[PDB]
Each structure stands twice: as C-alpha cells, then as structure tokens.
Amino acid sequence: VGSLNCIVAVSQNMGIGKNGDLPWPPLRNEFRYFQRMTTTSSVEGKQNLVIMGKKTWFSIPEKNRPLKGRINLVLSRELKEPPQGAHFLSRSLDDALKLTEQPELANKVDMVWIVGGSSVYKEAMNHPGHLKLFVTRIMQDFESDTFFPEIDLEKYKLLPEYPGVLSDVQEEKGIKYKFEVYEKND
Ligand SMILES: NC(=O)C1=CN([C@@H]2O[C@H](COP(=O)(O)OP(=O)(O)OC[C@H]3O[C@@H](n4cnc5c(N)ncnc54)[C@H](OP(=O)(O)O)[C@@H]3O)[C@@H](O)[C@H]2O)C=CC1
Numbered sequence: 454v455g456s457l458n459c460i461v462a463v464s465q466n467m468g469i470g471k472n473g474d475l476p477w478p479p480l481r482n483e484f485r486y487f488q489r490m491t492t493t494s495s496v497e498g499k500q501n502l503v504i505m506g507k508k509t510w511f512s513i514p515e516k517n518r519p520l521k522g523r524i525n526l527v528l529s530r531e532l533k534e535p536p537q538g539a540h541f542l543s544r545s546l547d548d549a550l551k552l553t554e555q556p557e558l559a560n561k562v563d564m565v566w567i568v569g570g571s572s573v574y575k576e577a578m579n580h581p582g583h584l585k586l587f588v589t590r591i592m593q594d595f596e597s598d599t600f601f602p603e604i605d606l607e608k609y610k611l612l613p614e615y616p617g618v619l620s621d622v623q624e625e626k627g628i629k630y631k632f633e634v635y636e637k638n639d
C-alpha cells in the first residue's frame with residue numbers, strides 16, 4: 454500500500470454537509486478534481502482504495518455508486534454486509550487498513566483515500582505515520598450540520614504547491630474556492 458490521504462471540500466465555517474447533502478449547489482469542477490485525485494494510480498495494474506463511512510456512501514447518488522475505477526470500502530459498526538454496490542465493509546479504520554495488508558488486496562492497492570465523514574476524518578487525522586490532507590476551501594459560509602475537525606497547524610504544514618493541483622482561486626456558480634495540500638509525519 455502506498456500513501457494514506459484524506460480528501461474533503463469545506464466551507465468557510467468548516468461545514469462538510471447538510472441533511473446528508475453538500476451545503477453548496479453542485480460544483481462540477483470540484484467533483485472532477487475529486488474524481489481525478491482518487492481514481493488516478495501512480496503505479497500500473499494497481500487501483501486506489503476509497504474508504505468512507507455509512508452516511509458518506511448513502512450521500513452519493515445511486516447512479517454514481519460505487520465510484521468507478523476504485524475499490525470502495527464502507528466503514529460501519531451496525532452493517533453485517535457491505536451496502537449493495539459496495540465491495541468491502543470494515544468495522545474500523547485499523548481493520549480496513551489490515552485488509553490492505555492481506556494477500557487479498559495486497560497486490561491490488563496503490564493509494565488509500567479517506568472520503569468522509571467527520572468521524573472518519575477525525576480518526577485518520579490522528580492515525581500516526583504519514584498523511585496528506587487534500588482540502589478544497591469553498592470560500593463562503595453555508596448552513597451545515599456536520600463539520601471537518603480542526604487542522605492542527607503545529608502538525609500539518611500547508612505545502613506552497615503541489616504537482617497537479619491549481620494554486621489560484623477557482624470560481625463556479627459565482628462561488629470562489631481554492632485547493633490546499635497539507636502534510637503530516639508523526
Ligand atoms: N464536502 C465533503 O467533502 C464531504 C461531505 N460529506 C457530507 O457529510 C454528511 C455525511 O457525513 P457524516 O455524518 O460525518 O457520516 P459518515 O459518513 O462518516 O457516516 C457515519 C457512520 O459511519 C460508520 N462509521 C463512521 N465512522 C466510523 C469508524 N471510524 N469506524 C466504524 N464505523 C464508522 C457508522 O455506522 P454505524 O452506525 O453504522 O456503525 C457511523 O454512524 C452528508 O452531509 C455528506 O454528503 C461527506 C463526505 C465528504
């Protein structure tokens with residue numbers, strides 16, 4: 454297994470969702486970037502693994518489920534089997550990760566990407582070792598009911614730049630947003 458990464462889009466008030474939806478109107482290019490970043494494998498014949506909670510899986514339209522070209526794993530404690538369309542179910546982040554390290558997916562997975570929700574982000578962010586946070590900062594306030602945890606700048610450094618990530622302000626539906634990359638190693 455390669456790289457452990459987190460990807461999230463957050464509003465200025467740190468909101469990541471509302472009533473199981475996105476707090477903002479859909480942003481086609483922000484989704485394009487989420488798709489490209491998670492699907493792309495930096496090693497041939499390998500696939501990226503996408504880890505998400507139960508609410509995140511149920512938040513993507515059915516037609517877009519499962520995310521194509523990636524291994525989808527749902528993190529749940531109540532589910533007995535993966536939702537329909539899903540490929541793996543783990544009870545925890547640590548179990549999801551051990552599965553990687555099985556001859557099963559062993560030879561199969563390149564990078565591991567955590568795509569939501571808060572509880573999932575909150576624990577990855579505390580998982581020790583190397584980690585990168587891919588943050589899309591949606592530059593306005595939006596009514597939200599679920600937030601991204603606080604980024605500890607004493608541990609995560611904002612990268613001045615990063616290969617294949619635009620550095621300037623983006624704008625869609627007259628909504629301004631920018632791409633950020635933070636790295637930790639502890
Ligand atoms: N803007 C962005 O970038 C993103 C926005 N969102 C949005 O956020 C909301 C979905 O969010 P969120 O509420 O935080 O919920 P989750 O997606 O993270 O789902 C919650 C459930 O997932 C399982 N689970 C979650 N964490 C763990 C764990 N660490 N170990 C085991 N099982 C776990 C549990 O199921 P159980 O009860 O079943 O055991 C828990 O109740 C919607 O609003 C969604 O659209 C989601 C992702 C990214």
Ligand SMILES: COc1cc(N(C)Cc2cnc3nc(N)nc(N)c3c2C)cc(OC)c1OC
Binds near residue numbers: 567
């Ligand atoms: C409303 O339509 C859609 C909603 C979603 N959801 C809400 C999940 C979603 C959306 N954007 C993200 N951005 C980033 N930057 N990181 C994430 N983890 C994202 C997730 C996790 C995902 C979609 O395709 C993946 C989608 O296609 C239309």
